[PDB]
RNA sequence: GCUUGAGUCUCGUAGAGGGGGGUAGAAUUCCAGGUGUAGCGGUGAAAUGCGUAGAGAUCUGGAGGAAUACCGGUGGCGAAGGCGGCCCCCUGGACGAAGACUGACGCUCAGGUGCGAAAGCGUGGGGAGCAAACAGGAUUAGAUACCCUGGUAGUCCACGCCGUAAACGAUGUCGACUUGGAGGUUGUGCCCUUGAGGCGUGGCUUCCGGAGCUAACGCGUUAAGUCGACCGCCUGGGGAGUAC
RNA sequence: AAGGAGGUAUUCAUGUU
């Protein structure tokens, strides 16, 4: 299993749905027996520049150990979901189960 | 001189650490050269990747004439 | 290079500060280099020649700093 | 390249002694598995000339090892090509 | 006519010519002036003095609106690039911001070929 | 038979190495609209050209193509050509540490096969910017040019063909030996890391220089030094890399 | 554009700014 690290920024209007989306993605990964090493909802953060004329996205970070097929499926879900403004998934060698600097 | 990263034995830049990236960018938003900063070459490349990833995630501005 | 006039700041000082900020940014140099298309061969040749010139004079100074001028 | 567990399985299968990795049979088996694996990749990416060069090196190395084994021990050569299904 | 007491001065300073345009904060243009209108032609219109007189002409043009505050946005590699700012200060506006807005590409379109002169 | 050459395995390291697919922002162009008015554009100086049907400028929205500022470095990677935003998938090579393993399995290579910048060709798309040809305006005694305003192939994509470059380090590949210094980059061992340090030990890489070599220029442990193995090539200049 | 200084260039507390 490959360690991934996902950050997906959500439209602030849809901030009330973020725990639901978090639960759905967690359930998918857990159903695929993927580990979840970190999950940190950063909240609204006042983006440096207006993405699609919108500010203050809901960042939400999540470090995961899961297979690549489920990651690809999750990426497709991100692309098709209008709620999430942006997302990025990056491979990592080791699961960094430590506190994030901004949360710290 | 005085490469800051090798002083603490940092393994990776961890782009989420904005404050360090703020030190290593200029007011206009571009990356300060390693010749000026004093960073080692390997950490400089890691720092450049981290800043670019942060710019994509909109934690840092590409330029000051953006928003 | 955004500049905002500080409280109790003279205009001439502000203008000189703005010129300093533009110099540090290197705007004029960038646009001037981008005025015309430089071929990749020309760019590589120019960079290499400049490095050679810099290195040569460094060696020249560091060596000729041990001689009797008079 | 090739995963660790797959390499361990091949070494166990073809090794005269389980820890004898340097065996010519083991090397040929490892090369054959890697060559067979890359067939799908190069079918997908016909323009990957840089990787195909490494593939050619593997093929040439395998035939050199096979020639050496044929010189040294004919029976081992026949058995190995039977195991791996290699034309001559 | 609609007094606003704060304007934006866009100074487009090319090598050949300098165009100064006073506008509202939102973007609607109020008045403009250029060295060509100032009468200088060619080698004389590509000089800082022409930019200064064009800035003065523009300030007179937008004098009707009674603008007091003025933020400056200077753009382009122009010969003067500064004489316009000095002229506006002399004309008697409070300069609030001095901002450079030169459009620098991030390795975009190919520039024209080098001149062989 | 042996283990020193060669190769395999264990753990890590750095890299614009390659292929495929997404995505980001700046910028150019065009379109629609608002504000606003007589110039804009260009040159050594002008004109062609564009603008009262409202240009240029300024603001908002949209479409599209191409390329990735800063970082960036006589830095890195690749056999060479060459490779530069970020992310994911597939994939090649190199190097270091400690060992274990096979046991000469090696080096070179005519024919042969493959890769091979740019321009060019075929079929089908795409087309923002740039720009051979071409058109116009200038310059000049002339200007089939340099300069200016436009501008088609092409530059981009997919699949084929072409197979040439000052494809250059003008230096074939492999191996061994021979004084040094200053750096860069990437590993790694030890010494109290007395905190950014001190002493080693590899790989790749830039400069200076000794013997030696060279016609000289210069090369100089990455040799053009002292040698060994294999291959390619030269025999005065033109005619000619031309004719058949 | 012209003149002066330092270096191969920076360490030179952050803060302030
Ligand atoms: Mg291998
Ligand atoms: Mg031009
Ligand atoms: Mg190399
Ligand atoms: Mg041949
Ligand atoms: Mg071509
Ligand atoms: Mg074609
Ligand atoms: Mg066509
Ligand atoms: Mg032309
Ligand atoms: Mg043109
Ligand atoms: Mg040839
Ligand atoms: Mg070349
Ligand atoms: Mg040759
Ligand atoms: Mg060979
Ligand atoms: Mg030398
Ligand atoms: Mg011929
Ligand atoms: Mg020829």
From Swiss-Prot, chain B:
Q: Name one GO cellular component term.
A: cytosol
- Source domain of life is Bacteria
Q: Which InterPro entries match?
A: Ribosomal_bS18, Ribosomal_bS18_CS, Ribosomal_bS18_sf
What's in the keyword line of the UniProt record?
A: Acetylation, Ribonucleoprotein, Ribosomal protein, RNA-binding, rRNA-binding
Biological process (GO) annotations held by this record are: cytoplasmic translation; translation
Q: Name one GO molecular function term.
A: small ribosomal subunit rRNA binding
Listed under subunit, the entry gives: Part of the 30S ribosomal subunit. Forms a tight heterodimer with protein bS6.
What's this chain's function? Answer: Binds as a heterodimer with protein bS6 to the central domain of the 16S rRNA, where it helps stabilize the platform of the 30S subunit.
Q: Which PANTHER family match?
A: 30S RIBOSOMAL PROTEIN S18, SMALL RIBOSOMAL SUBUNIT PROTEIN BS18M
Family, according to the entry, reads as follows: Belongs to the bacterial ribosomal protein bS18 family.
Q: Which NCBIfam families match?
A: S18
Q: What is this protein called?
A: Small ribosomal subunit protein bS18
Lineage, please? Bacteria, Pseudomonadati, Pseudomonadota, Gammaproteobacteria, Enterobacterales
Swiss-Prot record, chain C:
GO CC terms on record? cytoplasm; cytosol; cytosolic small ribosomal subunit
GO process annotations (BP) = cytoplasmic translation; ribosomal small subunit assembly
Q: Where is the composition biased (Basic and acidic residues)?
A: 59-70
UniProt GO MF annotations: rRNA binding; structural constituent of ribosome
Pfam annotation, one family: Ribosomal_S21
Q: Which family does it belong to?
A: Belongs to the bacterial ribosomal protein bS21 family.
Q: How does it assemble?
A: Part of the 30S ribosomal subunit. In stalled ribosomes contacts ribosome rescue factor SmrB.
Tell me the protein's name: Small ribosomal subunit protein bS21
Source organism: Escherichia coli (strain K12)
Swiss-Prot record, chain D:
Q: Name one GO cellular component term.
A: cytosolic small ribosomal subunit
User: InterPro entries this protein is in?
Assistant: Ribosomal_uS15, Ribosomal_uS15_bac-type, uS15_NS1_RNA-bd_sf
The domain of life is Bacteria
Q: Name one GO molecular function term.
A: rRNA binding
Q: Which CDD domains match?
A: Ribosomal_S15p_S13e
Q: Which keywords does the record carry?
A: Ribonucleoprotein, Ribosomal protein, RNA-binding, rRNA-binding, Translation regulation
Q: Name one Pfam family in it.
A: Ribosomal_S15
Q: What induces it?
A: Part of the metY operon that extends to pnp, also has its own promoter.
PROSITE patterns registered for this protein in UniProt: RIBOSOMAL_S15 (PS00362)
Which BP terms from GO are recorded? cytoplasmic translation; regulation of translation; ribosomal small subunit assembly; translation
Please verify whether the record's keywords include Transmembrane helix: no
Q: Does the keyword Transmembrane apply?
A: no
- Give coiled-coil spans as residue ranges: none
Which SMART domains would you find in this protein's record?
A: Ribosomal_S15
Quaternary context: Part of the 30S ribosomal subunit. Forms a bridge to the 50S subunit in the 70S ribosome, contacting the 23S rRNA.
Q: Which PANTHER family match?
A: RIBOSOMAL PROTEIN S15, BACTERIAL AND ORGANELLAR, SMALL RIBOSOMAL SUBUNIT PROTEIN US15M
Q: List the HAMAP family.
A: Ribosomal_uS15_B (MF_01343_B)
What protein family is recorded?
Answer: Belongs to the universal ribosomal protein uS15 family.
Query: What role is this protein assigned?
Result: One of the primary rRNA binding proteins, it binds directly to 16S rRNA where it helps nucleate assembly of the platform of the 30S subunit by binding and bridging several RNA helices of the 16S rRNA. Binds to its own mRNA, stabilizing it 5-UTR and preventing its translation.
What is the name listed in the Swiss-Prot or TrEMBL entry for this protein? Answer: Small ribosomal subunit protein uS15
What organism is the protein native to?
Answer: Escherichia coli (strain K12)
Curated annotation (Swiss-Prot), chain E:
Tell me the GO BP annotations in alphabetical order: cytoplasmic translation; translation
The answer, when asked if Transferase is one of the entry's keywords, is: no
Q: Which UniProt keywords apply?
A: Methylation, Ribonucleoprotein, Ribosomal protein, RNA-binding, rRNA-binding
GO MF annotation, one: structural constituent of ribosome
Q: Does the keyword Ribosomal protein apply?
A: yes
Identify the GO cellular component terms for this protein.
Answer: cytoplasm; cytosol; cytosolic small ribosomal subunit
Q: What role does this protein play?
A: Located on the platform of the 30S subunit, it bridges several disparate RNA helices of the 16S rRNA. Forms part of the Shine-Dalgarno cleft in the 70S ribosome.
Q: What other facts are recorded?
A: Has been predicted to contact the N-terminal domain of IF-3 based on footprint studies; exactly how IF-3 interacts with the 30S subunit is controversial.
- What's the subunit arrangement here? Part of the 30S ribosomal subunit. Interacts with proteins uS7 and bS18. Cross-links to IF-3. In stalled ribosomes contacts ribosome rescue factor SmrB.
Q: Which family does it belong to?
A: Belongs to the universal ribosomal protein uS11 family.
Name the chain's protein: Small ribosomal subunit protein uS11
**Organism encoding this protein:** Escherichia coli (strain K12)
